[PDB]
Design a protein around this ligand. Structure first.
Ligand SMILES: *[C@@H]1O[C@H](CO)[C@@H](O[C@@H]2O[C@H](CO)[C@@H](O[C@@H]3O[C@H](CO[C@@H]4O[C@H](CO)[C@@H](O)[C@H](O[C@H]5O[C@H](CO)[C@@H](O)[C@H](O)[C@@H]5O)[C@@H]4O)[C@@H](O)[C@H](O)[C@@H]3O)[C@H](O)[C@H]2NC(C)=O)[C@H](O)[C@H]1NC(C)=O
Ligand SMILES: *[C@@H]1O[C@H](CO)[C@@H](O[C@@H]2O[C@H](CO)[C@@H](O[C@@H]3O[C@H](CO[C@@H]4O[C@H](CO)[C@@H](O)[C@H](O[C@H]5O[C@H](CO)[C@@H](O)[C@H](O)[C@@H]5O)[C@@H]4O)[C@@H](O)[C@H](O)[C@@H]3O)[C@H](O)[C@H]2NC(C)=O)[C@H](O)[C@H]1NC(C)=O
Ligand code: COH
Ligand code: COH
Ligand SMILES: *[C@@H]1O[C@H](CO)[C@@H](O[C@@H]2O[C@H](CO)[C@@H](O)[C@H](O)[C@H]2NC(C)=O)[C@H](O)[C@H]1NC(C)=O
Ligand SMILES: *[C@@H]1O[C@H](CO)[C@@H](O[C@@H]2O[C@H](CO)[C@@H](O)[C@H](O)[C@H]2NC(C)=O)[C@H](O)[C@H]1NC(C)=O
Ligand SMILES: *[C@@H]1O[C@H](CO)[C@@H](O[C@H]2O[C@H](CO)[C@@H](O)[C@H](O)[C@H]2NC(C)=O)[C@H](O)[C@H]1NC(C)=O
Ligand SMILES: *[C@@H]1O[C@H](CO)[C@@H](O[C@H]2O[C@H](CO)[C@@H](O)[C@H](O)[C@H]2NC(C)=O)[C@H](O)[C@H]1NC(C)=O
Ligand SMILES: CCCCC/C=C\C/C=C\C/C=C\CCCCCCC(=O)O
Ligand SMILES: CCCCC/C=C\C/C=C\C/C=C\CCCCCCC(=O)O
Ligand SMILES: CCCCCCCCO[C@@H]1O[C@H](CO)[C@@H](O)[C@H](O)[C@H]1O
Ligand SMILES: CCCCCCCCO[C@@H]1O[C@H](CO)[C@@H](O)[C@H](O)[C@H]1O
Ligand SMILES: CCCCCCCCO[C@@H]1O[C@H](CO)[C@@H](O)[C@H](O)[C@H]1O
Ligand SMILES: CCCCCCCCO[C@@H]1O[C@H](CO)[C@@H](O)[C@H](O)[C@H]1O
Ligand SMILES: CCCCCCCCO[C@@H]1O[C@H](CO)[C@@H](O)[C@H](O)[C@H]1O
Ligand SMILES: CCCCCCCCO[C@@H]1O[C@H](CO)[C@@H](O)[C@H](O)[C@H]1O
Lengths: 553, 553
């Protein structure tokens, strides 16, 4: 027979279940619909559905009333929308989490084995006719081809939104504390337990590595003055694992917390900035609390950074990305009246989606210099050579690149992209269209609709044969972008629900933890309530260069 | 100086914090009070406080209107009270959790290191004058003395509430899936990760031990027919760790999931009952879903047992214990409208409190026989000798013993009790009185008040010197009981908030997970919605003996 769940009969998040030898059932519990496949709207849902404006429209309101917005901004209406934006967006991520690479059903194991990345949608049944279930060709497009043909960059297409490189890295740095696929266990597993913003890419992802990094005195972290400025410590004091190439394992071979952070000045840069911050947070605290030991000073300053990060990521990172006129705001109390689980579990689909490699430019301008990938990659003096102030000022000036539209992934890194498309298949993520539904959107009816153009469109059809067959990672990049937007519709509609669920689902954001004593003192609490990119930098330097998630001018 | 937090200046859950060299501050955020020590009621709190009846009174209403109750029982008023009972009780356990044996403050570590048991109240500062902080003698009563003098049983005082042994064990069995203090790491740490009702005392507490126990076919568990009846499998097929004494490690040396369950027929008994159930749940499922593999059949049946257990524990276990006329009810939906975190972390204070060793009788009647501890303990044929039906019928007939009042802990096990009092000190739990406050009660003003009598009372004063010095585990047993109640006031007022927070905080109880598809089919869902002690037994036997948490007649 043909495993009925292969057609994806259940709609609106209904659970498909095999019953007997060839039949199935949809569990439409709390889906808002009743019916064999959850297709009959309840009295209200019907109301909801008929009165709900398109995401297309909403994204239009948020990006146009440059007046209605300055006003809505200066009032509570701002908080109302924030509290709205949040709740609604987050209400889409099943929490407690649901499935993993091993189970396409709820299990105690899935719940408790932190190692497993979690999936929003189950996987395409190993017995389904086509690779994607029902429609498509017996073979998905050779990802080697698919890549170079549509994702390989020809002419560097800069991000119309002004995004710069200073953002490009922070983005990379920041995302590598929860995305850490285990080579050993393979796709669908993560070393980054804690699944969130625990800065385990600073303090490391294990007590030992932390200890090996911890200078167990004043709660601070180790480090070394090179040129007079503070930098991370080398393995020769911070005896901990890394990935620096076999060459000078002693000097300029720094320990950070995120094993791979030596392979690019940008990563080590920020890494330095944060460490420089932590110890800075310790200096303040210690003054406020002399009767405090090392353990406290450490943990508390950590929280002050888990805070600061969650604030900058929201009021500055997501802001820039959003392009909204609405001025996002981070105030955990906005949900104290909602039903909101304070727990997160990174998702494989949220992982793929975050592969914004096309951000990375052609070369790397640094004042008059202009390092190439060979020069840049694995370099190890650039950072201490140029100094933080300077290097920051350099990224904050060179633009990043459009992430959507297609064809804008530098060739050097284009390999990554091909592997993502290969893993996605290993994982068996359902069709791009199937994810559109799940994330409150309409399934595309044609490639011509997917893509703004006609070329890539026809050609893709030729390959996938049927729009529904189309894949997750590819569609997400081959999709037409909102005019001037850094990326298309599906990226935000799918990204935000994962992002905000993650940002606010953080324990520190809960009523329980959100007090001034959790940051010991009022001082701690304010450092979180007022963090800035500009402050994370200029408060840990000698001079204040230029820094922002967008190019000046 | 004297560490100010040693006086416990902060009231109503206010957080004490050292500021400078000798001063402190109370963080009264959301405590309902403002003021240097959180002593000034907010407009509402004041309302709340003035209009709130005593726990003494409430426990009186719940245990008296044998008419007003039969009525309130047959109506929604029942659900209202349940939903009330729950929420309110659970609102007392800080979740996300707060501190552990290592930190008397919020920390990312405390949050994430599952190993650590969690504490409700911080610990008595290592620098405080007295052992308990401010009041008392330079030395706590020699726990060896304290025990034998007030906890050592003289004449067996049976539980007025009718509780029997069939309950005594289920209680023990059930509580050992979350209470598993690590000899290695020591007091304040637990092997039982998952901190809850995950039946990791059946399927074991690690994937391997599970696998070693799993018969990887039909999702069932291994086992062996002895006499014709099904029993657990020996290490010779279920190659897994245990603690059976060095003697006959081959035959009648059974593997269960809970390492220690061989050391008492009662434990192995239930262990058998549940296993016998699981495989039973598999037989049903498999019929409903032939197209199902082993992994599914396993996980799903597991959930059906995590369910069943949470139902019997609530509508029958807590019921009997409660003595309420209100008929408790397990229906997860009752909280779907409340703000309730679906996560739990066992607490050291909840651990101590659960040391109901005085339950265990003098000997063990089994029809005409009458095994002693020597005979009973570590026996290994009694179970297969007598057969489940019979042994169940035997415990369900012999009474248990009052848990409170003092002096009712058999001598054989009295050692346990002395260690509990020793560990409590290792842990540094604050004074019994300090916990009364924290759990919505008034601090005792004298031993004469604590205890109903005058003797133990005076004598104890002589020892502790000041009521406030009194300890946690001791007060909890030396406290006078509610007339006819199995134990005093402080046990329920402190136990329920830990219990219900734990029972409903279970992932399966959440909206997300509480669907019929999580138990695959409607059949699964009903097995959970209708479990009984009587069914957990008589549905896994040849004949239906007598079974209940109370003696017949
Ligand atoms: C999260 O989840 C992942 C898995 O998704 C966990 O990692 C995996 O863990 C398993 C077990 O720990 C591991 O197992 C693999 O399977 C091999 C097969 O084993 C054989 O077949 C059965 C299995 O039980 C046995 O009957 C066999 O007989 C043995 O019995 C004797 C008993 O003493 C053995 O001593 C003797 O060897 C005999 O053969 C036999 O065991 C297994 O042999 C091998 O270990 C292999 O690794 C997976 O490989 C793990 N890796 C992954 C990523 O899949 C992970 O632990 C979970 N996370 C946490 C912390 O809970
Ligand atoms: C939950 O939390 C518990 C702890 O509360 C965790 O278990 C404990 O884990 C720690 C570390 O893993 C372990 O450490 C103990 O401390 C000894 C002291 O170590 C020395 O002093 C410092 C410490 O970092 C170092 O500077 C010293 O120098 C070393 O540096 C070299 C670097 O390569 C070393 O190779 C070399 O040996 C050198 O001496 C030195 O390390 C430590 O030596 C020893 O391991 C000791 O065990 C605790 O003992 C653990 N046990 C407990 C229960 O306390 C647990 O892991 C957490 N749970 C999880 C899973 O997160
Ligand atoms: C938006 C974030 C971001 C950026 C800017 C970025 C920038 C760069 C970059 C530019 C200097 C280079 C040379 C690389 C190179 C790599 N990246 Co990324 N990566 C990023 C997010 C990721 C993620 C996410 C993964 C997958 C593994 C994981 O962390 O789970 C990744 C994986 C890789 C891999 C391993 C193979 C694979 O999974 O395909 C290589 C090699 N990379 N990356
Ligand atoms: C209400 C539950 C219950 C019962 C009926 C029970 C019945 C019995 C019993 C009767 C046949 C005997 C001989 C024992 C014997 C022991 N019990 Co318990 N125990 C119980 C709950 C506990 C807990 C809880 C612990 C502490 C360790 C842990 O599991 O974390 C414990 C610990 C012990 C220890 C280890 C030392 C210590 O911590 O003091 C011994 C020995 N015992 N127990
Ligand atoms: C690593 O980076 C350094 C600079 O940080 C590179 O050295 C510079 O190279 C350019 C030309 O490539 C010279 O004009 C500069 O004067 C150099 N700066 C100094 C003073 O060192 C170096 O080539 C890079 N190494 C690698 C890995 O390619
Ligand atoms: C283990 O339990 C068995 C019974 O299950 C004990 O054997 C019984 O002992 C009594 C007297 O103590 C006899 O009258 C019964 O006839 C015995 N039952 C049978 C048929 O074995 C045995 O003594 C116990 N062993 C230990 C550890 O003491
Ligand atoms: C529910 O979903 C199934 C799956 O696609 C629908 O399909 C079945 O019935 C169709 C309408 O008659 C046929 O075209 C299909 O052959 C048949 N396939 C399967 C999987 O059974 C079914 O109609 C849907 N029901 C509703 C109410 O729309
Ligand atoms: C707040 O708590 C402290 C701690 O007990 C109270 O005690 C201080 O002031 C008392 C009243 O004058 C004195 O008896 C104590 O010597 C002094 N001790 C400490 C720890 O400072 C304080 O009065 C309380 N304040 C209120 C408003 O009740
Ligand atoms: C789980 C830890 C935090 C992960 C998320 C942090 C950054 C994610 C990056 C982008 C977010 C998703 C889409 C980008 C544009 C802004 C999203 C829309 C905002 C909204 O409307 O709510
Ligand atoms: C965390 C896993 C579950 C732990 C709890 C299960 C059983 C606990 C035992 C006793 C509960 C506490 C007091 C006993 C009497 C009943 C409590 C009062 C009930 C109420 O009023 O809500
Ligand atoms: C127009 C914005 C009004 C305030 C925010 C409303 C919620 C915005 O958030 C999101 O908007 C999307 C549309 O792009 C919807 O598809 C999502 O379901 C919704 O969560
Ligand atoms: C309030 C609901 C009105 C009807 C639904 C929205 C009307 C169409 O909305 C349109 O959607 C387009 C798609 O991106 C945008 O480009 C347009 O700016 C917007 O006006
Ligand atoms: C009309 C909806 C409320 C907000 C409107 C914001 C945009 C109004 O459009 C206005 O057009 C004018 C003509 O060139 C310019 O002078 C203004 O700068 C521009 O904001
Ligand atoms: C009289 C019972 C009315 C319905 C249940 C109300 C909440 C009962 O529950 C508990 O009662 C205790 C009193 O013993 C209080 O101290 C606790 O704070 C409360 O949670
Ligand atoms: C509605 C509030 C009325 C005033 C507070 C309760 C009145 C006293 O309540 C009493 O408490 C005693 C203590 O256990 C019980 O023994 C009595 O049965 C009860 O009547
Ligand atoms: C009065 C509060 C409402 C419920 C009252 C339940 C208890 C009433 O007391 C009644 O006393 C009678 C005299 O012997 C007996 O016949 C009844 O069985 C007994 O329930």
């Amino acid at each position: 027979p043909v495993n009925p769940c292969c057609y994806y009969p259940c709609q609106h998040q209904g659970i498909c279940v095999r019953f007997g030898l060839d039949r199935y059932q949809c569990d439409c519990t709390r889906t808002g619909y009743s019916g064999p496949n959850c297709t009959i709207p309840e009295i209200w849902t019907w109301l909801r559905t008929t009165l709900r404006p398109s995401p297309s429209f909403i994204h239009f309101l948020l990006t146009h009333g440059r007046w209605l917005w300055d006003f809505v901004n200066a009032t509570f209406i701002r908080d109302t929308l924030m509290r709205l934006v949040l709740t609604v967006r987050s209400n889409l991520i099943p929490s407690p989490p649901t499935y993993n690479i091993a189970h396409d059903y709820i299990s105690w194991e899935s719940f408790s084995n932190v190692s497993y990345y979690t999936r929003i949608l189950p996987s395409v049944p190993r017995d389904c006719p086509t690779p994607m279930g029902t429609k498509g060709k017996k073979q998905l497009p050779d990802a080697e081809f698919l890549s170079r043909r549509f994702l390989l960059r020809r002419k560097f297409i800069p991000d119309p939104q002004g995004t710069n490189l200073m953002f490009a890295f922070f983005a990379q740095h920041f995302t590598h504390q929860f995305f850490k696929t285990s080579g050993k266990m393979g796709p669908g597993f993560t070393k980054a337990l804690g699944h969130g913003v625990d800065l385990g890419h600073i303090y490391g992802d294990n007590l030992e590595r932390q200890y090996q990094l911890r200078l167990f005195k004043d709660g601070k972290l180790k480090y070394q003055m090179l040129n007079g400025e503070v930098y991370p410590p080398s393995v020769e004091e911070a005896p901990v694992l890394m990935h620096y190439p076999r060459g000078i394992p002693p000097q300029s071979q720094m320990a950070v917390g995120q094993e791979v952070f030596g392979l690019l000045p940008g990563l080590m840069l920020y890494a330095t900035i944060w460490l420089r911050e932590h110890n800075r947070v310790c200096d303040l605290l210690k003054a406020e609390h002399p009767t405090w030991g090392d353990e406290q000073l450490f943990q508390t300053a950590r929280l002050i950074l888990i805070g600061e990060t969650i604030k900058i990521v929201i009021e500055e990172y997501v802001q820039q990305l959003s392009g909204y006129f609405l001025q996002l705001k981070f105030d955990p109390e906005l949900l104290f009246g909602a039903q909101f689980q304070y727990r997160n579990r990174i998702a494989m689909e949220f992982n793929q989606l975050y592969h914004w490699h096309p951000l990375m430019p052609d070369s790397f301008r640094v004042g008059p210099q202009d390092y190439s990938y060979e020069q840049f990659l694995f370099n190890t003096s650039m950072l201490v050579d140029y100094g933080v102030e300077a290097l920051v000022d350099a990224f904050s000036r060179q633009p990043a690149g459009r992430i959507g539209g297609g064809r804008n992934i530098d060739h050097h890194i284009l390999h990554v992209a091909v592997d993502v498309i290969k893993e996605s298949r290993v994982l068996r993520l359902q069709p791009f269209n199937e994810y559109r539904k799940r994330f409150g959107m309409k399934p595309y009816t044609s490639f011509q609709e997917l893509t703004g153009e006609k070329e890539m469109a026809a050609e893709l059809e030729e390959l996938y044969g049927d729009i529904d067959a189309l894949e997750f990672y590819p569609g997400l990049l081959l999709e037409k972008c909102h005019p001037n937007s850094i990326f298309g519709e599906s990226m935000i509609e799918m990204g935000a629900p994962f992002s905000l669920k993650g940002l606010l689902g953080n324990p520190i954001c809960s009523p329980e933890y959100w007090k001034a004593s959790t940051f010991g003192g009022e001082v701690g609490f304010n450092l979180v309530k007022t963090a800035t990119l500009k402050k994370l930098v200029c408060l840990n330097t000698k001079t204040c260069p230029y820094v922002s998630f967008h190019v000046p001018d």
